[PDB]
Design a binder for this molecule. Sequence first.
Ligand SMILES: CCCCCCCCCCCCCCCC(=O)OC[C@H](O)CO
Ligand SMILES: *[C@@H]1O[C@H](CO)[C@@H](O)[C@H](O)[C@H]1NC(C)=O
Ligand SMILES: CCCCCCCCCC
Ligand SMILES: CCCCCCCCCC
Ligand SMILES: [K+]
Ligand SMILES: [K+]
Ligand SMILES: [K+]
Lengths: 98, 192, 244, 269
Amino acid sequence: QRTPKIQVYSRHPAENGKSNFLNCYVSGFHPSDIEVDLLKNGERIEKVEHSDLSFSKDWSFYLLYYTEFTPTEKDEYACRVNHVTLSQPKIVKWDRDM
Amino acid sequence: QQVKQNSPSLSVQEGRISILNCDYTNSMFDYFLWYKKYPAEGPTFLISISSIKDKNEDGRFTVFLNKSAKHLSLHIVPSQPGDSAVYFCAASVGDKIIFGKGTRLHILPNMQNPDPAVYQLRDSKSSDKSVCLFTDFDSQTNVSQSKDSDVYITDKCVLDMRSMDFKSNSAVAWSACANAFNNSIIPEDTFF
Amino acid sequence: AGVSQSPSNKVTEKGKDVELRCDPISGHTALYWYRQSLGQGLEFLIYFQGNSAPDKSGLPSDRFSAERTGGSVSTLTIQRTQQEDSAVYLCASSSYRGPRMNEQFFGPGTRLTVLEDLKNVFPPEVAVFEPSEAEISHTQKATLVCLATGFYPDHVELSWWVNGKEVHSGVCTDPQPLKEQPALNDSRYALSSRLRVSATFWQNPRNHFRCQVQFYGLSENDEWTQDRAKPVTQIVSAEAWGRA
Amino acid sequence: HVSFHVIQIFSFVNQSWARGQGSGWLDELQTHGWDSESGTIIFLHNWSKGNFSNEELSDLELLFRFYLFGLTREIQDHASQDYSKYPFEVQVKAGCELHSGKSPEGFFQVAFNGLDLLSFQNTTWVPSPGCGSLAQSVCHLLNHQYEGVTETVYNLIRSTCPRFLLGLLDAGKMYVHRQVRPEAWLSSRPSLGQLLLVCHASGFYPKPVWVTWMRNEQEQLGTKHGDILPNADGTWYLQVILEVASEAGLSCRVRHSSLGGQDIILYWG
Ligand SMILES: CCCCCCCCCCCCCCCC(=O)OC[C@H](O)CO
Ligand SMILES: *[C@@H]1O[C@H](CO)[C@@H](O)[C@H](O)[C@H]1NC(C)=O
Ligand SMILES: CCCCCCCCCC
Ligand SMILES: CCCCCCCCCC
Ligand SMILES: [K+]
Ligand SMILES: [K+]
Ligand SMILES: [K+]
């Protein structure tokens, strides 16, 4: 029973009012049952795509959640993960850097 | 047809090699099997080979597998009377099993020196009813069919594959005995 | 008990519905259905991987349908039977356990025969022709001849019995029957066999020779209405006792 | 050092419910998917059919479906004895490894609940050392009861797999050996625990890359070095942080195979 690692990052440099892609990379978890949500401002983004579930040499799982997004000032994005190894859903915020 | 057994029939002398051949087209076949089928019975498993191997021997039976040629071959040595049956090759991938159209192997039995003759036989109950019997003719002898529709002539019979004595070639004609088998090539050594 | 099939043989009139049963080996996950037409090899019909049919492609028409609700015993139904449906329907089962991948176990088969009408079905007339005295004098052998005549359809099983026991030595029967009127479609058949014995055996009067012919025709549960005995599946025999 | 492998993730939840996931992989590059509903392969690329025909791939799917039938059936059948085992996961990684001049290796690895259970070595199933009482149990079944499926597994991983792989590596040589230039940028965040300068490099392919912070010609030991992370493109992402006193002679150097000797140098202002 292993804990998920959550990493949030953008596909291209984030320019306010320019479409991009927000990635949430969930790795090193076991069992495979996971619930991953990309949040716009605490609200769940609906058109979220993801890669096919896969696993590492140690048999722990990994998966990529991605969404097309247009960033702006005062628009704070995050990734919310619920797994058996987590008491409460874990939220990793996306650091848009000013 | 992904499994092809060209040569629908074969004739081999008792005591000699019987080679049944088969060709497959599917590169994905991983197992090849052979089945023997007797008339009025369902096919029975005979011998198999995995595509890992190229030869499999079990008694008088050998399978050969050439994966380059996509050829599969069965060898019966020596062949005996009970080997007369239809032979099917099968090839499989997963649970898909493709069967060939079969080969009827006829094992011609070994028998004594010929003494060709034609005999008239009378029925047990009805004495009037007569039957002609052409018997004890050479292996290479051909029985030609009846010209007249009121006269019936049978082709050379098939000896019981469990027969162990009194092995002899014969044909029967029914409707006079002498001129009955004339349509067929009867030797000069024939007895009357 | 191995793989079994019901009925062993069925003779039907065109238009009737026919059901064929298969009892595979207990445990065997795969059940296959094939048919063998006279002048053809093994024609695949359908198979079952459990109680579901993955390949329902060999089915010759919409009338043909199969089921393995079990998935153990499977049935093949043929609606409104036609002359082209006449074949030996074979069934087989297999397991994925074991040393052989896809070693199938075949049932004995169901011979299906669909006729325009049953009025043409006839049992054979079996006669035994005693050995020629010209043969005993020349070879010191004695050939008995058996003749089954005027039977329809072409399927019969011939056997020779000497003193209550079945014999194979000196036996030879024709591989296929003979068409009496070969030009006619409704041609009745004939089949011959011989029994070669020693002069010394035949010449005993206490030796009993019987030629048995199993004919496959109609069933007891059949709608026969004719001024002639019903041509049911029956053994028709002819006998002979040794001369001196 | 070129390989192909499929992965299967079986989740056995209850006596009446079990789900499977599957994929094809050319090293860390997904080439195939699996539609569990129809039981067919998903060709992720124009070249992911390799040099196999549609009749050859059709038969691989038929073979895969058959294995899923028998596997799921047998597991549920044996688990229909003790239900405290439920829920449990089964993971399979099977494939082939190709070597220069050497005969190709084949591998089939099984893990029960995120722990190695079995291995197929030569012509025989081997249980995992120590971990597993089940390993010895299941290896006994496979070696004694399933000899037939074992020899179709042997053939698959040692004959079908290399044949497939070689034709796939030939079909997709241009994509697999493509070179994509990285897009690089600088950003700054306040240091929660001083300021944090972040250097990003993204959309580069292949995976090997080097991101360094410089002060003129001198390399500067980074504060935190990221992991190379995926992008949906098939490309990669990497970030390197440098903690500095606020507000000046600092550049970031991105080094990648695609850039042909010259490195991308990014200056801060
Ligand atoms: C063994 C290697 C032989 C190489 C030749 C094959 C090339 C195509 C492979 C891609 C399909 C991957 C899918 C297989 C995984 C799979 O089907 O199992 C889980 C299911 O989702 C359970 O429902
Ligand atoms: C099996 O699990 C599925 C998913 O949780 C559920 O829908 C189903 O009702 C469960 N059945 C039992 C018997 O627990
Ligand atoms: C195709 C058959 C799959 C092999 C069955 C393996 C049985 C393991 C269950 C304990
Ligand atoms: C308890 C389930 C473990 C089964 C392992 C699967 C073996 C793979 C052989 C095809
Ligand atoms: K078997
Ligand atoms: K970092
Ligand atoms: K992307």
